[PDB]
Amino acid sequence: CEIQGMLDDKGRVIEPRPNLRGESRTFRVFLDPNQYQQDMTNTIQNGAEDVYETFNIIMRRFKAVLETIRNLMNTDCVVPDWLHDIILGYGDPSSAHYSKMPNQIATLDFNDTFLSIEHLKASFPGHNVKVTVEDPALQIPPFRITFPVEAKTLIVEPHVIPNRGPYPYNQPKRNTIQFTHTQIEAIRAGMQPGLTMVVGPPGTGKTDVAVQIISNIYHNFPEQRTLIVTHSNQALNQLFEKIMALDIDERHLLRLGHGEEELETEKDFSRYGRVNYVLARRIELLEEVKRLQKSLGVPGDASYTCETAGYFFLYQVMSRWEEYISKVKNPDVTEVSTFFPFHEYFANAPQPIFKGRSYEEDMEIAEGCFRHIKKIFTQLEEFRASELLRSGLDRSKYLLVKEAKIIAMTCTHAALKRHDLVKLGFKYDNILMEEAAQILEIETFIPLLLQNPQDGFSRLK
Amino acid sequence: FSVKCWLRYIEFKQGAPKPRLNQLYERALKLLPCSYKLWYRYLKARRAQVKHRCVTDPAYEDVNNCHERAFVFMHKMPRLWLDYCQFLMDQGRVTHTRRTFDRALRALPITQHSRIWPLYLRFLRSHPLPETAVRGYRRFLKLSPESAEEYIEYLKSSDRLDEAAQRLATVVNDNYQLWHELCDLISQNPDKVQSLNVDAIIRGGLTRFTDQLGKLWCSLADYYIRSGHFEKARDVYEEAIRT
């Protein structure tokens, strides 16, 4: 009996209980999903006596697992070909890793762990670090790091995360903790196809490894989904607290729970609070696109919504942007400053973004500002679902199934609410999980049925 | 401020036509776009003039002319763009498709839908990545319940049954049902004779669309000449006798 509270003056369970007249208590509780399901089975199918209604007394200090077993067993149970064998032990157990799934990332984003290329040159102690170009005033990038399949060179090439406009506020977030060498190898063995169990000794930052994995997977796959699963709420709370310093938009973050839980980190990831915050962010995007419309200088006395905002973006901003494109890629440092009608738009921004000296730098600035207005229209594309979903829980599910690529879930909670997740968008292309030994074999295999096969094959990577 | 003198400076501009196009776009976007037909015929005559030279600077000046003629947005920088997409089709480089798609969508109308979707069709030729990727993005893009139908009917013609079934799934999740039936029959042609795909397509089609024993008896003859002789076939034919 997971008790919510006792009887009051108005017969309702507690949530300052009222004037407790007398020494009786009549309290309602709800232990689990399948709480009134085992007695239902006994009264309906086996026709045996009553367990939940034969009551005698109460004393203080499961069937959800059995229903999950029944479901997973009587479905196709098509598991990932690299993990069903590693779960039944048959097959060489060095196989579920990266070095025995064939499709290793040719060159992945090893961005976060390294913030100095000399640091990465140390943290690659057994590979010949082939860094492309030789200016150390030019090499500390989110480099591309190919490890080949001679055959042991760390092929690091520079990269430049593209602009986002004039503003120095969105300076794209890079990590700060220089995780270990085998820890970066943990991140890589997780972000490449296979399986990975990190042996995290006390203090080593298994949760830092998890935050690194979240970041690197959001980098090397913008579209595939991440189920970050825990044994207790500590993992999800701490990993959210840590990823609060990474390059994630809050339209890509969501979670599950086991019922009632109070927000343990700074900002809410929860259902109603998240829909409300995204409604406020939608107001932000609407006012942004609208002041951009006034920057374009059209007439009109009433304001528009998400659909008209997206169509109007593609109709006006994209048209002007194609004009500037056919002026710039057809192109002086004068026209890279002038020929952008974003002067009225970045006229609420720092001093002109096309510096008027380096045509290519002015081009980066102009395309970054246009792509920023396109990210305004893109968060408008995301708020399409906020304006299409009717209820708070409805918009929670819609925004977690549609755009939120990072869902943090608890073990028994997701084992209890997996069916709803399967039906309304359980997308498990990648799993990142914490508190490994803090679960069981049951709480490790019951999540293995969050979906149905995809033409004879599972969703796992 | 006479459009006469504007067209005169455009059609008398000699030498390199790059100062021509730059001053033209400057003045034309300065004053009103009433010279629409002038700049349009000018772009066509310029194509006659320079289409033999490099496709870099003349086609760039033309695209600039069209996007600048589009004062805010209009019905000819788009209809003209659909014509432009038709020309920019013998590419040899898909950057033409990418950039022209923007000319097609210099708005978000019935225009350039049937310019991009057959462009995804001519993308599906020997590389199914653009086909199925535009299929996904269009199924989750600017809403129209007919576009994803057309997507299923397009992937019906290419050898990726997953893309057809994917658009079918998207539309059935949210003629179209009959077109899903047609694509089901197309992938149900007797090639995968393991006797699974055609039967499951029969069940899905006869689930989303109702035929009174017609497709039922079609699938009946199919699965009963594909059935066995043991308990499986005894029971299957008995169930078909009863249902």
UniProtKB/Swiss-Prot annotation, chain A:
ATP binds at residues 178, 183, 203-208. Coiled coil: none annotated. It is found in: Nucleus; Nucleus, Nucleoplasm. The modification N6-acetyllysine is found at residue 423. Contains an N-terminal domain with structural similarity to ARM repeat regions; this domain functions as a scaffold for protein-protein interactions, but is not required for RNA binding or for ATP-dependent RNA helicase activity. Belongs to the CWF11 family. Involved in pre-mRNA splicing as component of the spliceosome. Intron-binding spliceosomal protein required to link pre-mRNA splicing and snoRNP (small nucleolar ribonucleoprotein) biogenesis. Plays a key role in position-dependent assembly of intron-encoded box C/D small snoRNP, splicing being required for snoRNP assembly. May act by helping the folding of the snoRNA sequence. Binds to intron of pre-mRNAs in a sequence-independent manner, contacting the region between snoRNA and the branchpoint of introns (40 nucleotides upstream of the branchpoint) during the late stages of splicing. Identified in the spliceosome C complex. Component of the XAB2 complex, a multimeric protein complex composed of XAB2, PRPF19, AQR, ZNF830, ISY1, and PPIE. Identified in a pentameric intron-binding (IB) complex composed of AQR, XAB2, ISY1, ZNF830 and PPIE that is incorporated into the spliceosome as a preassembled complex. The IB complex does not contain PRPF19. Within the spliceosome, interacts with SNRPA1, SF3B1, SF3B3, SF3A1 and SF3A2. This is RNA helicase aquarius. The gene is AQR. The chain holds residues 595 to 1089 of 1485 of the full protein.
From Swiss-Prot, chain B:
Associates with RNA polymerase II, the TCR-specific proteins CKN1/CSA and ERCC6/CSB, and XPA. Identified in the spliceosome C complex. Component of the XAB2 complex, a multimeric protein complex composed of XAB2, PRPF19, AQR, ZNF830, ISY1, and PPIE. Identified in a pentameric intron-binding (IB) complex composed of AQR, XAB2, ISY1, ZNF830 and PPIE that is incorporated into the spliceosome as a preassembled complex. The IB complex does not contain PRPF19. Belongs to the crooked-neck family. It comes from the Eukaryota. It is found in: Nucleus. Involved in pre-mRNA splicing as component of the spliceosome. Involved in transcription-coupled repair (TCR), transcription and pre-mRNA splicing. The chain holds residues 33 to 285 of 855 of the full protein. HAT repeats lie at residues 16-48, 58-90, 92-126, 128-160, 166-188, 193-226. This is Pre-mRNA-splicing factor SYF1. It comes from Homo sapiens (Human).
